[PDB]
Ligand binder design. Structure first.
Ligand SMILES: Cc1cc2nc3c(=O)[nH]c(=O)nc-3n(C[C@H](O)[C@H](O)[C@H](O)COP(=O)(O)OP(=O)(O)OC[C@H]3O[C@@H](n4cnc5c(N)ncnc54)[C@H](O)[C@@H]3O)c2cc1C
Ligand SMILES: Cc1cc2nc3c(=O)[nH]c(=O)nc-3n(C[C@H](O)[C@H](O)[C@H](O)COP(=O)(O)OP(=O)(O)OC[C@H]3O[C@@H](n4cnc5c(N)ncnc54)[C@H](O)[C@@H]3O)c2cc1C
Ligand SMILES: Cc1ncc(C[n+]2csc(CCOP(=O)(O)OP(=O)(O)O)c2C)c(N)n1
Ligand SMILES: Cc1ncc(C[n+]2csc(CCOP(=O)(O)OP(=O)(O)O)c2C)c(N)n1
Ligand SMILES: [Mg+2]
Ligand SMILES: [Mg+2]
Lengths: 582, 582
């Protein structure tokens, strides 16, 4: 029973209907940047006693904060912007939320309805621009459609395969007085008709049947299992199948477990890729068969029977045609298969110890390794220290690059929604704002941003947002003074010819530039810089123990390479296991 | 006779054809940020001995730098980015270059042709996204189309009404070897068929005829006259008609002249708006009748015969239907009308001294005024000092807000392409990167960024670009600690109820936050902060005299309001002339 701030017979502004529509959706936090087209919304936002607004310093930071808010909680992330340049600054976040399937709802202001199409002031057709980078978008043409469109937006953004939904609201609609109807149904007939039904018991038995007939099975877990942590953990108990996770599925199955193969793919471990290559049964639960995981599709699981489970019927048979397919919630498919495995425990043999001890041979032969040069800080080792000092219980957001892979390789995430990273779009500067939204969604959680010097500076303006909002965001900056991941491809395929990848000052090469500590100092954030490996443990411990925000400039040798590596479009027999830029 | 770096019978990479296509267009500077999809281009960029690359710290800064490069020189601005997040970061600049008609060419990398549509890694349909915010865009599907598409891109971006043109280049096309054909014609039949012919002598005489018959004529000059500085200066000699410029036409006719009415519109001077309201002939040369200039269209020049000259036939009669219309280059229309006025000098009376001395009455009755409170720095006065200390010969780029209007009101720009500001889209954070491109295009010019604390922080990362590239960019920061322009609308129409407009730290209200000096310090840039009006003249003089970059944190009282003001959709009888937030 919701309690409104207005009488049921009292006319109110359209912006008041919009804010109340958010309150009725359970929204507690929004990331709104004001402007002329959304000032009525920002005015009605102050009249709400339940919706907190985190004012960013850039709308790209606002939408990225809404992603980290969403990614670290499962709730939908809500960002608000004004028309024109405010909306165009959300584009990177919307395309990012789409490719990673993040529940997000973006509300942009717009010129009055009478002015749409005249190339007016701050007038851009944001609906036409964001049509291919959003799950769905709207353009409110009447104040009475506000409750229905907002309900459809949150339903579309959260149900099925989640994604971003944009709601363009003209200025005159925000000002028009009306009495909202909260009981009008949603106009989504063909969407709901396509919502997958619970999986049939016939499909689940044949999958369980194929498990007992298989000798070398591999679990291909991805971002679709973030809500099935317990269901997947029980499923491996009854089967004993090794688990290979994606960049997005990290945390679904604990990386520190003996059955874990960690990450597979281009930068995935050798033993995980070996398991998929030489498997006879591939259980692809909650994945989309990205090119960064398969490489040449004909070589991916070429000797394996593929079982694909998805909530998006478009992903099934999209890149790799499976044997058996199940269109539905993998959380339910695991629940059904679990009670089939325990009731048929005696019937089914289920002892793949020959197969996993074949993989454990590769696990000790080709493990995740890193060199330590003198006292220079290995970035891999620095992240391994953060794992130890936080007991693997810290929410980790990252940028995109070498530091992004090392944060995925050398951290043992125990639970899902702990690993926040742009994997689909791979957007730099995602780290710092995502940690902002994650800290707001989880106030009592250790939130650490493992960013790179190139990614960190892109949205460095959000350091002011961290201090103003008093958020205990930790910034573990892995400063390599380079556009590292691009530099690595230059060393491998372009004879180490630098093409605009150095980020420091060429007039002073051996001086670390920029001095990121002064960036934190400008925003009243305590900062420190560590260079030698001995001082690394205390420095990270100081960052964690110091209350509030903290930036740690961890200096790393730039010649490091992310290993192992499979070149774009290769097979398992093309994995690069050694080598750097020295 | 161009000199290629390759034999005419030698196959070369597609990226080498692309760079050579830029060299053949006279490109001397590009603003490129590397990525996996554009690494081949960045590799071929290093092999060029004539194209300098300014590496930004954010692609939004790269495209804004290309705008300032273009806006301050008339040459086309070229920015390059990678696929996915690199391209989505150009969106704000492309929509900005479209609404302000800035010649710009954007080159984005893309996944190989065989992968377009699979929602691949860093794969977004940038052509579909940017179709409504670009003059035109391309998707290269064969390496042999590179010379033709690049030639069509630069021709479309510069000819007619200029605008942005995007060229999406897949990765496999950059790698494909070929021998380019530089002599293939452009496939633009219906574009060139619509290119306006030189204006007929019949139209120009009737315009000159209407000038002698008119008693109260007003010149409505805009961004279309930036290339007609001399032609417009001679036209007013032969007619004596007062000149009212737009936010975009600033500098076309010197603001310090006795016939100048300065800016008209929402925040335009009272005497300029009075001239248009009580005119009988309105010469609208190079304008588009924006809502920020006309307000209620029925009241705009309601008693005036409207003569509209444009190179875009779509703008003629778009918002305000004119009497006489001329579709063509205003530079030629002025040349034709000039030689008609001097050959008919004796026939035509041409003495509007009764009308301009009627306007000079309003010029002294309601001039541009500002209060000076104690020793607090008036932002208007600070800009007036910069005009004096630079002799009005400094290239000025600004953000968007209160400081943007005061930089337009209280600076006497003597020549066009000296005033760089986002007027159409009104994009914040445009100031600092635009000054970067302007300084590269005009190395020996005084480049000053009159930015606001909200706009400056959005693209503050480009301070590293200024130091690395050793550009003498001056930053005159008008720090009001608020989202000023939005705060002003709160004081006027929302009873001064603050809705997320304060940018400092609420835990320490009287402390200036953030300390922007440490931002400059982090990037090795000398900085200073002035608070008292007496120290203002020496501080600005120190900024100018100090070689290289320099940031001046000018603190201003936030209660200041931009005056005069006409509310959105009003008439001339609705102008607000006094009032602030005190
Ligand atoms: C520099 C860089 C390197 C990278 N290299 C790698 C790498 O080596 N290895 C790697 O794995 N990734 C890598 N990526 C990331 C890669 O591009 C993809 O993000 C990754 O493949 C994601 O795979 P995913 O399908 O598990 O994630 P997602 O895209 O999040 O998975 C979405 C899928 O889950 C389904 N789904 C969602 N909910 C449900 C449900 N309830 N029931 C059933 N299905 C559901 C969706 O329908 C969809 O099919 C890299 C990224 C970057 C930036
Ligand atoms: C906060 C804010 C406040 C603003 N308030 C004002 C204000 O008070 N006053 C004001 O003037 N602006 C104001 N603006 C800016 C406003 O939105 C527009 O940018 C402004 O009206 C531009 O008018 P313009 O047509 O002269 O500029 P432009 O858009 O640059 O003019 C383009 C026109 O010139 C034509 N053209 C180009 N080349 C030629 C040629 N060779 N021959 C003939 N025609 C040509 C084009 O076809 C087109 O019609 C404000 C902006 C902001 C951000
Ligand atoms: C906005 C954006 N631009 C470009 C890219 C392409 N890119 C991917 S990784 C990388 C280099 C980033 O280096 P850094 O952020 O410093 O992390 P590092 O690899 O050095 O550890 C780039 C440019 C991207 N993913 N996003
Ligand atoms: C990216 C973007 N977001 C929002 C707006 C709307 N807007 C226009 S002016 C302004 C306030 C800017 O204040 P500031 O940059 O500090 O300049 P000031 O008015 O304070 O002098 C805003 C938010 C915009 N033009 N661009
Ligand atoms: Mg780095
Ligand atoms: Mg300001």
């Amino acid at each position: 029973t919701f309690i409104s701030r207005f009488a049921p017979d009292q006319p109110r502004k359209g912006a008041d209907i919009l804010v109340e529509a958010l309150e009725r959706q359970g929204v507690e936090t929004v990331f709104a940047y004001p402007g002329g087209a959304s000032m009525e919304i920002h005015q009605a936002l102050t009249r709400s006693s339940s919706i907190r607004n985190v004012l960013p310093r850039h709308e790209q930071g606002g939408v990225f904060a809404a992603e980290g808010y969403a990614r670290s909680s499962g709730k939908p992330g809500i960002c608000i912007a004004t028309s024109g340049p405010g909306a165009t600054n959300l584009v990177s976040g919307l395309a990012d939320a789409l490719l990673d399937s993040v529940p997000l709802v973006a509300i942009t202001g717009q010129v009055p309805r009478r002015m749409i199409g005249t190339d007016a002031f701050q007038e851009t057709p944001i609906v036409e621009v964001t049509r291919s980078i959003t799950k769905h978008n709207y353009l409110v043409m009447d104040v009475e459609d506000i409750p229905r469109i907002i309900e459809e937006a949150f339903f579309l953004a959260t149900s099925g395969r989640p994604g971003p939904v944009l709601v363009d609201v003209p200025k005159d609609i925000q000002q028009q007085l009306a009495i909202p109807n909260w009981e009008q149904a949603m106009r989504l007939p063909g969407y709901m008709s396509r919502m997958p039904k619970p999986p049939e018991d016939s499909h689940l038995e044949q999958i369980v049947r194929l498990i007992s007939e298989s000798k070398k099975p591999v679990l291909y877990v991805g971002g679709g299992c973030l809500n099935s942590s317990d269901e997947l953990g029980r499923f491996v108990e009854l089967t004993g199948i090794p688990v290979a996770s994606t960049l997005m599925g990290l945390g679904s199955y604990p990386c520190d477990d003996e059955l874990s193969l960690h990450m597979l793919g281009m930068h995935g471990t050798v033993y995980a890729n070996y398991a998929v290559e030489h498997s006879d049964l591939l259980l692809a639960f909650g994945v989309r068969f990205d090119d960064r995981v398969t490489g040449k599709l004909e070589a991916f699981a070429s000797r394996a029977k593929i079982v694909h489970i998805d909530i998006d019927s478009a992903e099934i048979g999209k890149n790799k045609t499976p044997h058996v397919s199940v269109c539905g919630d993998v959380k339910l498919a695991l629940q059904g298969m679990n009670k089939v495995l325990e009731n048929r425990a005696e019937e089914l043999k289920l002892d793949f110890g020959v197969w996993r001890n074949e993989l454990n041979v590769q696990k000790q032969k080709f493990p995740l390794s890193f060199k330590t040069f003198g006292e220079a800080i290995p970035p891999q080792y620095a992240i391994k220290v953060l794992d130890e000092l936080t007991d693997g219980k810290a929410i980790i957001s990252t940028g995109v690059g070498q530091h992004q892979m090392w944060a995925a390789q050398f951290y043992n995430y125990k639970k899902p929604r702990q690993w926040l990273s742009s994997g689909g779009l791979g957007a730099m500067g995602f780290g710092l704002p995502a940690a902002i939204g994650a800290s707001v969604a989880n106030p009592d959680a250790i939130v650490v941003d493992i960013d790179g010097d190139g990614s960190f500076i892109m949205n460095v303006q959000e350091l002011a947002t961290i201090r103003v909002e008093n958020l205990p965001v930790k910034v573990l900056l892995l400063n390599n003074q380079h556009l590292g991941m691009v530099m690595q491809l230059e060393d491998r395929f372009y004879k180490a010819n630098r093409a605009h990848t150095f980020l420091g000052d060429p007039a002073q090469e051996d001086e670390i530039f920029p001095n990121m500590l002064l960036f934190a100092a400008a925003c009243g954030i305590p900062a420190a810089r560590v260079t030698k490996k001995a001082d690394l443990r205390e420095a990270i411990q100081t960052m964690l123990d110091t209350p509030g925000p903290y930036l740690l400039d961890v200096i790393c040798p730039h010649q490091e390479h992310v290993l192992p590596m499979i070149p774009s479009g290769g097979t398992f027999n093309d994995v690069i296991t050694e080598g750097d830029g020295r």
